[PDB]
Amino acid sequence: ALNAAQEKEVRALVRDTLVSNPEILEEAIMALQTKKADEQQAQFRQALASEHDALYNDAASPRIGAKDAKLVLVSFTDYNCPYCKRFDPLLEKITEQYPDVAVIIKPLPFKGESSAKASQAVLSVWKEDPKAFLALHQRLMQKKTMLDNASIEDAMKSTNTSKIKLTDDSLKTLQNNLELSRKLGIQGTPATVIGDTILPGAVDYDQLEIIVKEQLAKV
Amino acid sequence: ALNAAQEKEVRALVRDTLVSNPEILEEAIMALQTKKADEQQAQFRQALASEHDALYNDAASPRIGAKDAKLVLVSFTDYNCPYCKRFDPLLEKITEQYPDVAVIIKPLPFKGESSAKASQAVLSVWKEDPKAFLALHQRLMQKKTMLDNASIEDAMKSTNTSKIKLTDDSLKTLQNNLELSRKLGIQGTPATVIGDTILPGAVDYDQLEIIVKEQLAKV
Amino acid sequence: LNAAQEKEVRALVRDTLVSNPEILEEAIMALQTKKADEQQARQALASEHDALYNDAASPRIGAKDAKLVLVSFTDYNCPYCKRFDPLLEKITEQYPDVAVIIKPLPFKGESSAKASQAVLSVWKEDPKAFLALHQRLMQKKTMLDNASIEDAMKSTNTSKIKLTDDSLKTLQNNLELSRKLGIQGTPATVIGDTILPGAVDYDQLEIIVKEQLAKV
């Protein structure tokens, strides 16, 4: 053992050490990144059921894939999130390889104004010209640099959506995405809803393919 | 209480433990998501506790399944609700496949006049002749268009309950269900209490099996 | 100290966190403000001068006394990074006055963090072997996994080198760095006072390097 008083001082040092040096946390996160484990969460079934219509029946939420689809994934993502930029082509590839599968995008504004603006832009484009959304979506994901208004205008120009107005209705959609994320325990991106579980972060295509196939099976 | 060299060393052992063993972090994350999920559900669970006798001990509320079941679902349903019609067979299937599980029906007058009349009919049947309840319950639930005077009467004719009087007392039980739905936050049908969670809509058999199995284990 | 007590501290770290998730929620909050403190889209590369150019743990391709040092933020699993790396190398080959520092990033997932651990670990212990492993991992056309990484390290005489936990500290520093410079994707190359935001034609790259080299 060790002094019953020393025990409680170690417990406090665990708290003070982590909160004061978040690089410790971020390195621990880096360490967890090297472990190939899907960290699927089932803590939120009730909340997912309770929010079914907000997840899957919101016409303002862009869709990649078939409206006909048998399985719909919900991607909570941020156009400025580096892991998001890399995880999205995997999600896209699922819909290409499994046409029975579609992905609903829920953009989030976590990394600031330009995230909010990009979110606004794609949501607006989706509402006015659904078929032009995917190109703009991809173009934003390809930006290697922190977005700003200039680089968003460029993305819209090179994807012929520059003439589409960013609307106020789209911001209501964005605030829904946010409150919805709040309720599903989603505090980081990318988070992916696949049936009853949430995939709290990005995974390898191999792991994603298996998870889709298992849920695509259940229906 | 603890020297400076050991404070210095407990602090360094925080970083090392977490970075060397990311699994600790993963546990801590799950623990947190569980905390979140539980806190978001606390109001609902308090209500479930407060309305326990109205939920589980009202002899006027019909039951499908063993009176001594280990687990009792509570189905808030409406005979004119088309999703209730798709879902009810799944709830029945659970009692068929899992004899330790029973379902209590809470009929609701949500969709209109014939919803109140249909609820009154099955509640009235249940109390006079419980054995005769289920065939009528099934029959009304099978009807595809909204019920009216004639189809409720035909439903009772084909299930030999036509000669059972629809009581005023049966309406006390109906009003009780309304009260119960308000206090539990049930603002639509179907809704199912399963242990300490509530399914707020129709879900496929598999997803319902998983919740029932899980809640059955915790007993 | 005291090896027995040290065992308990380790188990306390786990039990304290798992039994009180609120500590983790504070810590994430603390991390949030950290990421806020850093994020920023002729600005921040200047502040981050020592991080950029004087990290011993950061691998270098080219002369140690080079007059121009490009900084390559890159990912071993990123196809555009795989195609662009040979071009940055060719620059050092054709312009021995130009060196390239490598900042591996984990953006494309679990193998990217491992590939990054391997090269940073090899650079600390066996710097002579870094370049061979770097090109090897960059020349694989499939997603890295544990097998192809081990296979790549055998081929380059580095299979006896442990992938350290300390190299993750460096990998997290690269994450910090890219936040402060507004680098959200790969490849991205720092050249003088400007950041080249993707894969470009060699001819284009050459022109920019040649001008910055003359600015010195």
Numbering used by the authors:
A (entry chain B), B (entry chain A): 4 to 222
C (entry chain C): 5 to 45, 48 to 222
Q: Which statements did the authors publish about this structure?
A:
The three crystal structures—which we refer to as compact, transitional and extended —reveal an extraordinary range of motion in this protein. Importantly, the compact and transitional structures have multiple protomers in the asymmetric unit that adopt the same overall structures in each case (8 compact trimers, RMSD ∼1.5 Å for 645 Cα; two transitional trimers, RMSD 0.5 Å for 653 Cα) so that crystal symmetry does not appear to impact on the observed conformation. Moreover, the compact and transitional conformations were determined from crystals grown under similar conditions (2.85 M sodium malonate pH 5.8, 20 °C with either 0.1 M cobalt or copper added). Nevertheless, comparison of the eight compact and the two transitional trimers in these two crystal structures, reveals an unprecedented level of conformational re-arrangement (RMSDs>20 Å). In the transitional PmScsC crystal structure, each of the two trimers incorporates protomers in three conformations: compact, extended-like and intermediate. The two compact protomer conformations of the transitional structure are similar to those in the compact crystal structure (RMSD 0.9–1.8 Å for 188 Cα). The two extended-like protomer conformations of the transitional structure are similar to the protomer in the extended crystal structure though they bend at different points in the linker helix, giving rise to somewhat different catalytic domain placements.
Although it is annotated DsbA-like, PmScsC is a powerful protein disulfide isomerase that is able to refold and reactivate the scrambled disulfide form of the model substrate RNase A just as rapidly as the archetypal disulfide isomerase E. coli DsbC. Unexpectedly, evidence from chemical cross-linking, small angle X-ray solution scattering and multi-angle light scattering all indicated that PmScsC is trimeric. The N-terminal residues bring three catalytic domains together into a trimer, and a unique flexible linker enables extraordinary twisting and extending motions that impact on the catalytic domain placement. The combination, extent and diversity of these motions would enable mis-folded substrates bound to PmScsC to explore a broad folding landscape, consistent with the redox foldase activity of this key P. mirabilis copper resistance protein.
